[PDB]
Design a protein around this ligand. Structure first.
Ligand SMILES: O=c1ccn([C@@H]2O[C@H](COP(=O)(O)O)[C@@H](O)[C@H]2O)c(=O)[nH]1
Ligand SMILES: O=c1ccn([C@@H]2O[C@H](COP(=O)(O)O)[C@@H](O)[C@H]2O)c(=O)[nH]1
Ligand SMILES: O=c1ccn([C@@H]2O[C@H](COP(=O)(O)O)[C@@H](O)[C@H]2O)c(=O)[nH]1
Ligand SMILES: O=c1ccn([C@@H]2O[C@H](COP(=O)(O)O)[C@@H](O)[C@H]2O)c(=O)[nH]1
Lengths: 210, 209, 210, 210
């Protein structure tokens, strides 16, 4: 069904995600696991990046190596919970430019509310990685993509922890070219827009807010 | 090379190329080694077995997955394997850790153990053995020897760069050991360094001569 | 003249801060150094925290040890640049609750307004650490303290990298009980509200935005 | 009345140390705490380092800053347990040279056995930081100091987690110029050379060895 979805299949991700799902897992551990899983999802999510051959001189001899255009990578957390994922991916892409997009989803209305967007310069060359752990209805990530495109972004990859089918479908309907990398695809949403079985409220579980 | 996996990822190639570069100092070199090890870890741990287990999420009960976490063993070869171990332990924080010190003689091409301190090993244990430079292979073959002497069965070798001779030597002796690397280089020079390689890994990590 | 100000005097902080100040220092290194300085400033900023005696059994024998009320610590970055400080402090206080505050400061009117604030439960018992690297006019941190107090915060400690006299003075005028820990006190503000000699625009230098 | 001993008094160190002492604390957490305590002990152990004034140009203006001779710092773990400490201090001193000294203490004879020493160049200018968590009889650290001095080291600082009085005294008797920074001074040694109340076997508890 889901042309643009990659569900990353790795035993360590399964392991770690299951601990996150567990309601007894507190915020220190929940954050650690989120960072760690993002590091593994990063493997798959960045596999597409382009290399240029470049000469290198080693201590022994000259040879031909490889280079990515490093400043051309843009990492964009959706606040708050995407912050922790951004920390993870920046361990792998430490010379990326970073944007921040503040959106929350209104609990009652289930619409996205934008409160901040500060982005580095964007153009056709820029590879953007947008990060938000829970892709539920999709309204938040769609809004963030809207803001990215508006500001010149072309190539955008979404990295999430868990998606629901309707969220993935929503993103595909609007933005057919956006690839989505996740640790799991769950079953559906409950009446309050939470992913089932999911893991509850990610922001609250990360930061101990109520 | 039946047992060799050369991990092909653009981020690994990028980072490895900076490590190769003679101008890259110790602080960066270490960072890059740890970062590459995190990526090589993906591929090197793909084989680990899951058990299904019940979990209750805040929403509902469901079926999740679990690895026997204490049954993983991480074993750096001193010194330069230390930085790799730091990397992999980010991903496998509940592993037991062993340490092995081997001196390789350049003149005779023989290896001897100077230290080995291991956690309990048995058939169930998944051992990851870490050394950046797999050159002649004698060091990793000695470390595998020690591991097997102490009860290890399943051993996976993770390295940064290998030379063909080192890979062959390991496969001749220990045909079941899988080897994950960032690169397979061309050959060794008259002093047993990998070409083009990256020089002396330990010295470049810690700024020793 | 500055009752509530602690300028932390340590050769490593001076060293690292000098590197941040240097205009050639790129975003990767600037972030690193900010986190590392925050770790050292943490030493002094948390020295006041109260211990309870508790029994502990070690593998050899029982003894009396010490404990802090860990979940009663609250870390609050001011977005964006406080985010990197928060990562630093959370390495030492990983069981803290985390709040996030977004304040716009208007350059033309000198007024500050909240655009986001998401806080964990606050009360008299909670030890709050509020983090923002550049304490210039002071209006941003004063608005954040206002919001904290509004939501029940009592004990609040400000941690910054560099402050200007006017900022310190402004905080002391409003909130006489807030202690302020910094790596340096600089000379003054320029016509555009930047600290001299300071280090430029901290957010932009951390994230490579313009 | 131990002239060269500094017991670092900080409520976060006491908090963290108490968790390490607790026999139920597993290897993952034990390692994190040892690295975190070392960061705090680093504050006090490096306070003495010497600054040179240097010019820096910030994006705003030229000013006078500070600089330490960074490559002139040497970090030396005693294997194995010292490794985790070195990892912590290297977070603050990332440009330091690193030596390794392999010594274990024979459980039966309580004598130090050296199996490895690989050191960067040493001279009178070099500031050496020697790290080993448990300073019990002193034999290990005395042997390591011996090796350092033999190779040209002059200024040496010992950082440990817990010391026993007899170990501190033994170091003072031999090397009266070596300062020792620790998180705690415990009471005495038992019959097998373990610190009471201490925390058991540091190497085993870090790495899950028997
Ligand atoms: O099970 C869920 C579903 C949604 N959200 C939150 O709601 C937003 C995503 O929902 P949506 O905009 O994709 O519907 C994010 O802020 C996310 O953290 C959760 O925490 N858990
Ligand atoms: O190009 C090389 C070749 C070997 N070694 C070092 O030699 C050992 C591997 O030797 P071998 O036993 O595989 O020949 C390791 O400890 C490694 O750091 C290097 O640093 N660079
Ligand atoms: O020299 C300066 C002065 C201010 N700011 C920014 O302005 C805010 C502090 O402003 P103020 O409200 O203290 O004036 C912070 O968000 C900070 O990043 C700087 O980056 N550099
Ligand atoms: O309570 C103790 C006492 C000693 N040691 C170990 O013994 C050595 C220090 O003892 P000594 O040489 O100071 O006597 C170190 O390897 C240290 O890890 C412990 O682990 N726990």
């Amino acid at each position: 069904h889901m042309k643009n979805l990659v569900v990353v299949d790795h035993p360590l991700i399964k392991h770690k995600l299951t601990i996150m799902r567990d309601k007894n897992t507190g915020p220190k551990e929940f954050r650690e696991l989120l960072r760690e899983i993002t590091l593994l999802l990063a493997y798959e999510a960045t596999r597409h990046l382009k290399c240029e051959e470049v000469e290198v001189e080693t201590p022994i001899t000259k040879t031909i190596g490889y280079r990515i255009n490093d400043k051309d990578i843009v990492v964009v957390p959706i606040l708050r919970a995407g912050l922790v994922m951004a920390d993870g991916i920046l361990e792998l892409l430490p010379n990326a430019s970073v944007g921040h997009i503040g959106i929350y989803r209104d609990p009652e209305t289930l619409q996205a509310v934008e409160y901040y967007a500060k982005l580095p310069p964007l153009n056709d060359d820029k590879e953007v990685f947008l990060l938000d752990p829970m892709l539920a209805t999709g309204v938040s990530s769609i809004k963030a993509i809207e803001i990215l495109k508006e500001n010149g972004a072309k190539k955008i990859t979404l990295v999430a922890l868990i998606a629901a089918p309707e969220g993935v479908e929503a993103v595909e309907k609007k933005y057919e070219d956006v690839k989505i990398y996740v640790a799991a695809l769950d079953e559906r949403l409950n009446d309050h827009g939470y992913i089932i079985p999911g893991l509850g409220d990610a922001g609250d579980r990360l930061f101990r807010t109520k």
